[PDB]
Amino acid sequence: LPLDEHCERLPYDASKWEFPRDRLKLGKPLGRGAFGQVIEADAFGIDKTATCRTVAVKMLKEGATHSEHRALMSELKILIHIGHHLNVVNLLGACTKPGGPLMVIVEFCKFGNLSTYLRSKRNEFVPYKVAPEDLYKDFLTLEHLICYSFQVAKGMEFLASRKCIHRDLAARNILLSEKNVVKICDFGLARDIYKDPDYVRKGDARLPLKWMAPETIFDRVYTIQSDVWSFGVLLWEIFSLGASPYPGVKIDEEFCRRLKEGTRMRAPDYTTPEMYQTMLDCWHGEPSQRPTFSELVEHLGNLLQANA
Ligand SMILES: COc1cc(Oc2ncnc3cc(OC)c(OC)cc23)ccc1CC(=O)Nc1cnn(C(C)C)c1
């Protein structure tokens, strides 16, 4: 019973969210996308009185039509409804007044998307830091990876509590901020899905096939439990340190049939046995038999305390 299916009836409280365009200094593009783009900006006093703050701004670009403008307004309304959590990109304000573009402003996440980050830090990884050598080196450890996994499950549990589902959960839609904080986001229109190899043609649409549950590919069913399936794929990207899923597999009709029958990915190179078992559990063929995000939160939190 998803709330994000009927956004047009959600409210936009201008008196709280509206940010004056003259207090926003636009900077360099962080994207670009197809019909949308994300831009780095400096917002004056958006969340603390008279304080400059770097922010990320989503807006449309040349090629967008009034239908993308309606879609970005629905996105702003769903961000307001969802609200704030440490592990979700938090909405700071918006510019919706006539005479300028619609702009959605969110907190800036310094290190960008998790997929690119883990791939760039693949060489700087040690399962456990051993004293004294590694003590002053900023290496990625098994603890960090379990911690990112835990934070994404916490953010997903929060989203599910708001009666929302993601539909495109993947490491490319996770951002990394300071103090090892990860935030779920959705680039949407600001990602060029027509240039991106993670999106495969399926009818008239470009879909993230490698992250979709069998009931999504075959029956077009999207639920919180299909997001659990994508979470399992996200765990594989994390413990492969940013590798692309199903390596060497041609993403065609045969791949979908093999998946539907119970064929799964082998363990990634940096996983622990229990993290691989968590992946298999997220990839149960029956959606009801997959763990919930609340169960994943408890399990990953226990694993984090056991890894210490
Ligand atoms: C302005 O809005 C966005 C900005 C984004 O990009 C970035 N945001 C922050 N910092 C960044 C730093 C970067 O490099 C340093 C960056 O390099 C490419 C992109 C950055 C990504 C997505 C959105 C909109 C969005 O998440 N909408 C949405 C709808 N539903 N939900 C639910 C909660 C899942 C989320």
Phi and psi angles of residue 169, each rounded to the nearest 5 degrees, phi first: -75, 125
Partner residues linked to 201 by β-bridges: 206
Whether omega before 32 lies within 30 degrees of 0, making that bond cis, reads yes
Q: Which two tokens stand for residue 68?
A: 């993308």
Pair (33, 134) in one structural domain: no
Please state, in angstroms and rounded to a whole number, the distance separating the CA atoms of residues 29 and 25: 13
Q: Is 138 a catalytic residue?
A: no
CA distance 25 to 164: 32
For residues 206 and 182, membership in a common domain is answered with yes
What is the domain extent for residue 301?
Answer: 109-306
Same domain, 113 and 94: no
Instruction: Tell whether 187 and 146 lie within a shared domain.
Output: yes
For residue 184, which atom of ligand 1 is closest to its CA?
A: 34
Where does a domain end: 84, 108, 132? Answer: 108
Task: State which ligand 1 atom lies nearest to the alpha carbon of 109.
Answer: 10
Residues with CB under 6 A from ligand 1: 30-31, 38, 56-58, 75, 78-79, 82, 88-89, 104, 106, 108-110, 112, 166, 175, 184-187
Q: How far is CA 274 from CA 7, 88, 214, 267, 281, in A?
A: 39, 26, 23, 11, 10
Q: Which tokens belong to 144?
A: 């960090």
Catalytic residue among 13, 42, 138, 168: 168
Q: What is the distance, to the nearest Å, from the Cα of residue 84 to the centroid of all Cα atoms in its chain?
A: 15
Q: How many CB atoms lie within 10 A of CB 244?
A: 14
What CATH number is attached to the domain comprising 86?
Answer: 3.30.200.20
233 shares its domain with 292: yes
Phi/psi at 30 (nearest 5 deg)?
Answer: -100, -25
Same domain, 298 and 281: yes
End residue of a domain, out of 108, 132, 163 = 108
* Euclidean distance between CA atoms 5 and 2, whole angstroms: 6
DSSP 8-state symbol, 166: -
The answer to whether residues 228 and 145 belong to one domain is: yes
Together in a domain, 73 and 121: no
Resolution in A: 1.9
Q: Whose CA is nearest to atom 27 of ligand 1?
A: 186
CA nearest to 113, candidates 223, 31, 193: 31
Which mutation among 5, 10, 30, 151 tests ligand 1's pocket best, with the greatest number of atoms within 8 A of CB? 30
> Mutual orientation of helices 273-282 and 293-307 as an angle, nearest 10°?
180
Q: At what angle do helices 224-238 and 273-282 cross, to 10 degrees?
A: 150
Looking at the fold, whether 182 and 267 belong to one and the same domain comes out as yes
Asked how this structure was determined, the answer is X-ray
- CATH code (residue 152): 1.10.510.10
Q: In terms of domains, do 77 and 130 share one?
A: no
Indicate if 218 and 243 belong to the same structural domain: yes
Spell out the residues 6+ positions from residue 237 whose beta carbon is closer than 8 angstroms to its own. 114, 115, 118, 170, 171, 243, 245
Q: Can you state the percent helix, strand and coil of the chain, rounding each to 5? A: 45, 15, 40
Residue 132 identity (one-letter amino acid): P
Same domain, 132 and 275: yes
Quote the number of domains for the chain. 2
- Boundary residue ending a domain (75, 108, 141): 108
